[PDB]
Amino acid sequence: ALLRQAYSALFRRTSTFALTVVLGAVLFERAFDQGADAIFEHLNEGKLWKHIKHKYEAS
Amino acid sequence: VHNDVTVPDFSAYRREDVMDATTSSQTSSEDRKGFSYLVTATACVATAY
Amino acid sequence: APNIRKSHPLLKMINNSLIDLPAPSNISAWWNFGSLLAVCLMTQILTGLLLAMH
Amino acid sequence: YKETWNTGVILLLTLMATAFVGYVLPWGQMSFWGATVITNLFSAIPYIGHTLVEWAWGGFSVDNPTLTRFFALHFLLPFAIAGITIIHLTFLHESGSNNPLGISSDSDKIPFHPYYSFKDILGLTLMLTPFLTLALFSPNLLGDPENFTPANPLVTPPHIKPEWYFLFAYAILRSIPNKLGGVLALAASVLILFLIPFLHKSKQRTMTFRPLSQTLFWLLVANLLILTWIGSQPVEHPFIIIGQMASLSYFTILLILFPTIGTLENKMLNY
Amino acid sequence: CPGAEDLEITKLPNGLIIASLENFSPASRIGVFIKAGSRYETTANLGTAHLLRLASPLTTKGASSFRITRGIEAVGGSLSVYSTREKMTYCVECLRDHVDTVMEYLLNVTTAPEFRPWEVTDLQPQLKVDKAVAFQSPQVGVLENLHAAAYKTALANPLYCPDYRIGKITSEQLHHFVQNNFTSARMALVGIGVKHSDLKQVAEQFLNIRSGAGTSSAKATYWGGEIREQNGHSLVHAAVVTEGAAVGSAEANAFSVLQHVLGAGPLIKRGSSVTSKLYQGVAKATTQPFDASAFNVNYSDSGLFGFYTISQAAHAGEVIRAAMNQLKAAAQGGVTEEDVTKAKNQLKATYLMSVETAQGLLNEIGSEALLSGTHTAPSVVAQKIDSVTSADVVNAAKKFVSGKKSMAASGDLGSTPFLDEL
Amino acid sequence: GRLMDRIRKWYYNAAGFNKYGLMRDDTLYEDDDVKEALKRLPEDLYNERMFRIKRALDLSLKHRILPKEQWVKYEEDKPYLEPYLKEVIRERLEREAWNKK
Amino acid sequence: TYAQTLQNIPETNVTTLDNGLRVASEESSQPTCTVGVWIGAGSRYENEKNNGAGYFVEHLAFKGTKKRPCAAFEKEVESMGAHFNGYTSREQTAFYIKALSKDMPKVVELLADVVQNCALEESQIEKERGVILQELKEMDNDMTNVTFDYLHATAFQGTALARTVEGTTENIKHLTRADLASYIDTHFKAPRMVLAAAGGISHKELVDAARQHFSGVSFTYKEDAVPILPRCRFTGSEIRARDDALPVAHVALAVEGPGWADPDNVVLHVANAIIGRYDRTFGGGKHLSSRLAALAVEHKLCHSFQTFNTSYSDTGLFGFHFVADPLSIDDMMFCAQGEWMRLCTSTTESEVKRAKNHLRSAMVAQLDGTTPVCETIGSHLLNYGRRISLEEWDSRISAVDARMVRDVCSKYIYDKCPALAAVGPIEQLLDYNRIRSGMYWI
Numbered sequence A: 001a002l003l004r005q006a007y008s009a010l011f012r013r014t015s016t017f018a019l020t021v022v023l024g025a026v027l028f029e030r031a032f033d034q035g036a037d038a039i040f041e042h043l044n045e046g047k048l049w050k051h052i053k054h055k056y057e058a059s
Numbered sequence B: 001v002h003n004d005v006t007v008p009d010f011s012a013y014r015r016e017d018v019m020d021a022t023t024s025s026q027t028s029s030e031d032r033k034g035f036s037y038l039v040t041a042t043a044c045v046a047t048a049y
Numbered sequence C: 001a002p003n004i005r006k007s008h009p010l011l012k013m014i015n016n017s018l019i020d021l022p023a024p025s026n027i028s029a030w031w032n033f034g035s036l037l038a039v040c041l042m043t044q045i046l047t048g049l050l051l052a053m054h
Numbered sequence D: 001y002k003e004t005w006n007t008g009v010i011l012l013l014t015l016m017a018t019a020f021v022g023y024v025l026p027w028g029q030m031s032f033w034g035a036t037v038i039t040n041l042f043s044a045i046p047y048i049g050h051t052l053v054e055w056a057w058g059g060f061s062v063d064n065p066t067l068t069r070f071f072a073l074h075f076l077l078p079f080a081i082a083g084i085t086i087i088h089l090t091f092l093h094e095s096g097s098n099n100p101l102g103i104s105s106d107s108d109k110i111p112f113h114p115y116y117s118f119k120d121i122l123g124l125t126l127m128l129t130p131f132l133t134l135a136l137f138s139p140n141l142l143g144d145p146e147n148f149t150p151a152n153p154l155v156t157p158p159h160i161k162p163e164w165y166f167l168f169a170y171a172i173l174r175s176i177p178n179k180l181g182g183v184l185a186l187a188a189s190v191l192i193l194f195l196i197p198f199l200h201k202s203k204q205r206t207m208t209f210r211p212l213s214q215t216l217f218w219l220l221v222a223n224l225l226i227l228t229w230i231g232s233q234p235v236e237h238p239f240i241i242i243g244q245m246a247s248l249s250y251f252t253i254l255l256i257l258f259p260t261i262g263t264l265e266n267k268m269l270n271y
Numbered sequence E: 001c002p003g004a005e006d007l008e009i010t011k012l013p014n015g016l017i018i019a020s021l022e023n024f025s026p027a028s029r030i031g032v033f034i035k036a037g038s039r040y041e042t043t044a045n046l047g048t049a050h051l052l053r054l055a056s057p058l059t060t061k062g063a064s065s066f067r068i069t070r071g072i073e074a075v076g077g078s079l080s081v082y083s084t085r086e087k088m089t090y091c092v093e094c095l096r097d098h099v100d101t102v103m104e105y106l107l108n109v110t111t112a113p114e115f116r117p118w119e120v121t122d123l124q125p126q127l128k129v130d131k132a133v134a135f136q137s138p139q140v141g142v143l144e145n146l147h148a149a150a151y152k153t154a155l156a157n158p159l160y161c162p163d164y165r166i167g168k169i170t171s172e173q174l175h176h177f178v179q180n181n182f183t184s185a186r187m188a189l190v191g192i193g194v195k196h197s198d199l200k201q202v203a204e205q206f207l208n209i210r211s212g213a214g215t216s217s218a219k220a221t222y223w224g225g226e227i228r229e230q231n232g233h234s235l236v237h238a239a240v241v242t243e244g245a246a247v248g249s250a251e252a253n254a255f256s257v258l259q260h261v262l263g264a265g266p267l268i269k270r271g272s273s274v275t276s277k278l279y280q281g282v283a284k285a286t287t288q289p290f291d292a293s294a295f296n297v298n299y300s301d302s303g304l305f306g307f308y309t310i311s312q313a314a315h316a317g318e319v320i321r322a323a324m325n326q327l328k329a330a331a332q333g334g335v336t337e338e339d340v341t342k343a344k345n346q347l348k349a350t351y352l353m354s355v356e357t358a359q360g361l362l363n364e365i366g367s368e369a370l371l372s373g374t375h376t377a378p379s380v381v382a383q384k385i386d387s388v389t390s391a392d393v394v395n396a397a398k399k400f401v402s403g404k405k406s407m408a409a410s411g412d413l414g415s416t417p418f419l420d421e422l
Numbered sequence F: 001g002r003l004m005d006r007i008r009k010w011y012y013n014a015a016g017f018n019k020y021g022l023m024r025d026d027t028l029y030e031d032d033d034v035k036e037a038l039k040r041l042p043e044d045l046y047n048e049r050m051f052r053i054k055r056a057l058d059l060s061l062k063h064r065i066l067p068k069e070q071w072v073k074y075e076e077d078k079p080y081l082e083p084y085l086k087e088v089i090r091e092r093l094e095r096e097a098w099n100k101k
Numbered sequence G: 001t002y003a004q005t006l007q008n009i010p011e012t013n014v015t016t017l018d019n020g021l022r023v024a025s026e027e028s029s030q031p032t033c034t035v036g037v038w039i040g041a042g043s044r045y046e047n048e049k050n051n052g053a054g055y056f057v058e059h060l061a062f063k064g065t066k067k068r069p070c071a072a073f074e075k076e077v078e079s080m081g082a083h084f085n086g087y088t089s090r091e092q093t094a095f096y097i098k099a100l101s102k103d104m105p106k107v108v109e110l111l112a113d114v115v116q117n118c119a120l121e122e123s124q125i126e127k128e129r130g131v132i133l134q135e136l137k138e139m140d141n142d143m144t145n146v147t148f149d150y151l152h153a154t155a156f157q158g159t160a161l162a163r164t165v166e167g168t169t170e171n172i173k174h175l176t177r178a179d180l181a182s183y184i185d186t187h188f189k190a191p192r193m194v195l196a197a198a199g200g201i202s203h204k205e206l207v208d209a210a211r212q213h214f215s216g217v218s219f220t221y222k223e224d225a226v227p228i229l230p231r232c233r234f235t236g237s238e239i240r241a242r243d244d245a246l247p248v249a250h251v252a253l254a255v256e257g258p259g260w261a262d263p264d265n266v267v268l269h270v271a272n273a274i275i276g277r278y279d280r281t282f283g284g285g286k287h288l289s290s291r292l293a294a295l296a297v298e299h300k301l302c303h304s305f306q307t308f309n310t311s312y313s314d315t316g317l318f319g320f321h322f323v324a325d326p327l328s329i330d331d332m333m334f335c336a337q338g339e340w341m342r343l344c345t346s347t348t349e350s351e352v353k354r355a356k357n358h359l360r361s362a363m364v365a366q367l368d369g370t371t372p373v374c375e376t377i378g379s380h381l382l383n384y385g386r387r388i389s390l391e392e393w394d395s396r397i398s399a400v401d402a403r404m405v406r407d408v409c410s411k412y413i414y415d416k417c418p419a420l421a422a423v424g425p426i427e428q429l430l431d432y433n434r435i436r437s438g439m440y441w442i
């Protein structure tokens, strides 16, 4: 049971609750950004420089 | 007199696990708290971000 | 006094107006505007300074 | 009165930042140059040095983006001073004022008004006279003439030094040859005030009845005067050495002599 | 391993008696017994005995108030002072292993009080409190006024510091009261749960305020007064007595037995007392609930006897009257040779039961060792109890009906009668 | 010799709190101990010190001092609180030490 | 030595009669004694309709039996100098007698006659009914018990344990000769009873006299089986009976307890030994060792306070109670919860070492006389199923250390939703929420 375990190891001690909020945030950021960026780009296929860049990318 | 006093019935509000008056509520405690706290811990993470 | 929240000349202030302050139990959402106005203010000043620096 | 005192140190620090940024506003030779030398000091702080400075400057050198954020800061800080002054007096009032004899004055207190309202209004005019006399007859008696010259990045003035009220520390800065140590020494020169309360060994509060501590006190004052003076002169003999000497005596007096002479004084009283 | 030991009991030059008895209990209970109390107070130092009782945890010459409390507590010890109008006992309890530790403080408290002006000064307001919780029992209020109406001195002196004297007692008064009463010939170092030699070595080579009898209590002079406290409570408490028998007297046993014949407390929870003539007699008179008992006190140079009655207001009249008729009726030969045998046995038992308690024993043991210097064997005290004729009882009865009576009552007395109406 | 005694008497006179009519102990800074100490002083000594102190303050506010005749003489300076204050500290150190064990 | 005095404590003899009753006793060299039957019955065993019977029964247990009516029964006991007492709690009832060992047998007879043949005279009932009714009014003014009742009332709300031992007003106004009879015939049975005794009694002479008056045999297997009770559910909640007209306020707070059998109860007790108790008449005052007591004194926080570990067969209540003035309720509570937190997070060896000695002295004093010993035997069997000797208790207590007190208290107190009951002028004490948060972070 995660809720039970979670409670025990993460939410019971204030010190660990804090550690969770931090590490939790670090991972949440990394994933929330990638995901939203992903969504935004698909929603705008071929319009972003990221997309058309290749055409003139030739040094 | 105080002997004539009883606590009303909270079945309308109790959580599923502490609904049965003949079951130790302690066994489902870590769950009930673990959930609520899980919600809270998350709000912090969101805020932190 | 036992707990610092009440004795301290400053916490005592923060306490008697944001922690142990007696509030009616039935106030509605219409009472939320005081705090917002307050937050609203701190926010303007913050963004304002930032803008003034340019 | 620790808290009254500690907020006090904070008022001093704040006033310094305030008066420092204020001085750059007229953008004169000294304004600019002083700003360039003083702010660059932090560049000595390890690893996060340069970053912290270029951040503050808003660029690569004191330029327009600095002038603006300073004007902003200068307008702001004063108000923070006012706020904090309220806290200062708030802690102060918990205990009430102290007094020259250093012994409980509960057996003889008087209403502030009219006694002190009057006394202060008198002390206001007594000082205000010299202030006005100066401000009106000898206007620039205290200002560097170098600041009547528009800032020019291609002409370093001969002697870049901060305003008088800073010299004393500028002095302690140059005492320690080593960009990093000197900064810390500077920082300590003022932050030292936070320790005073923990260096009180006397069984008595004031120095009214401590003649030893008294000369030591006036020595220290004189010491600060010299430090101020050294700060105004160039970095050459015999100044350089006098500097280091005064800087040393400064910390010695506050960190070692004072508490020590304090203890000795207790034994002489049979305490 | 552990068996039958025999109660030893020395006596030193200065007159300090030392009783002892090892019953191999996993716990001890030493205790200093003393001839002192409100009985020795003068109009000038009233209450000083009381305050002294409360002052037990104040600093001494060998241990500070801090160490005395922390010290005793560090070993699950306990320290208490119980005292009557004429006796003060200082005892402590603890586990066998810590006696020597708890002993020091005990010793220090009774023979080395410093009574510092401040410590004292800050303690006095306590009397106001300690006295206020006690008087919650009306039971205690009348007894105070009883002794007041029963005597003109010594015993008439209240057990709790009178109000007007609160905060007026002085370190000197405390010091003097001690130096003049806590003297080696008025003290006993009783101790259950220890080897006599050990308890002895402590007393001698340690106790130092000494020798003499010091101040002597004036003879208890009988008055025969009547004090009435009109307060409004729906329940009226009343007590009517007559000078009774003294301690160590032979006419003592007589009253105790008359006591039990009349009725001294219930033995059946919520039960009626058929064996209690007094209770039963009253029961046939009033209809509402009540309580009536045979009151009996035996003091060094005097005693008190009569009855005590808690009753509804309006029925206080009927209840007291009855309690009386039942006493005269006893004096008029209304006692059965059986009634006497039942009593004698209830007394024997009650005596024997009120000794199982380590405290009850240490108390029984010490009381003798103080006002005697001996330990009456249990078969002797029995051989002494039953040896009481039917007459003896009826005689005690007579004495009450004939002697001058002094009454003390409190409550809504509107319907309660005066001493000269009985 | 009397070196220590020469010094003390000198410092005592050097300090000069006796020109106000104050006693060594009157100048003690009222920290936690001195506070308890004072509460234990017998009333007569407390009231006296109070007058002395209040008198000193009045001199201070007046920028005057007592006439030489009235100055407290080194050898007659009564150490009225010292004894109490020492026990107050003895007591504390006991408690401080005990709570540690 | 302490150690030895313990080993040398005579053993407690326990033999079971073919009918299920258990006879136990501790023989001493004492001329007087205490024998009685301790029963596994009480308000908990009652129900909505008979709640109070066990108490109504208690009121008649002495008003005479069939073989020898009121007058006679009373007269026969008084006349032998014996004391007859008894009580009834939520999970335990008991009737015991104090008399000379010489009458140990005639006593046993009397007992058996009370539990087995109570008169239940139709005319007596209607009187004790008026009596009990007044006892309720008198008890209603004892805030301390009005509080613990409410504590239960909510801590175990909706269950068997949430019932008062005395019972409802209605229940007492209508209970019947029948219901009472039924209660006795349903609950007072050999397998659930214990004839205990202590003093100068011979186990034999006792057990013999036992078989003689406690002969009733059982036929079916059901009659030999002790019925297990449906358990009671704990609930973090509060009940506030306010009345600014009362002079002081009463507060009780508690988390669920482990129940008789659990070993932790020892540590739990060792814990409460640390927090201990106070009451304005303790002379120790500011020097008392109990941190809470001190604060109580230094800051005039309360008139008294007590820690408790009320155990039951399958559950319990571990908390505290205090009486304070309307304006010092909060600081008091605040400090109190503080100590509980201190137990969980920072107990000291010094603290426990003492707590232990205080506890040891406690257990020993619980056996000060014959009635108290008998009460301990009557209970150990009924709850632990045997006798735990001071020699044992001591070993279990001696093994407790800080690290241990911490773990347990944490296990039962930390971050648990407590049950709270307040009575009186409790305005300053407020919000369950706030109190709930006082349950974590020292």
Ligand code: HEM
Pocket: C041, C044, C045, C046, C047, C048, C049, C050, C051, C052, C053
């Ligand atoms: C009381 C809160 C404030 C209010 C209601 C407020 C309102 C406004 C308004 C309406 C404008 C015009 C915005 C636009 O359309 O361009 C403005 C501009 C500005 N404000 Fe504020 N302001 C507040 C506080 C401040 C403060 C405290 C500062 C900084 C000390 C500040 C600095 C500025 C600056 C620099 C601009 C100009 C730049 C811009 O127009 O975006 N403001 N403010």
Ligand code: HEM
Pocket: D001, D004, D005, D006, D007, D008, D009, D011, D012, D081, D085, D088, D089, D092, D096, D097, D098, D099, D193
């Ligand atoms: C914005 C600057 C400040 C303001 C306006 C301010 C104002 C005051 C005022 C009004 C008083 C009461 C009257 C008096 O004794 O002078 C006071 C007292 C005091 N201030 Fe400041 N103060 C300031 C800075 C400081 C600083 C830098 C310190 C010291 C580091 C300080 C330390 C104190 C202390 C200790 C008192 C107690 C006076 C006593 O001995 O009775 N103050 N201040």
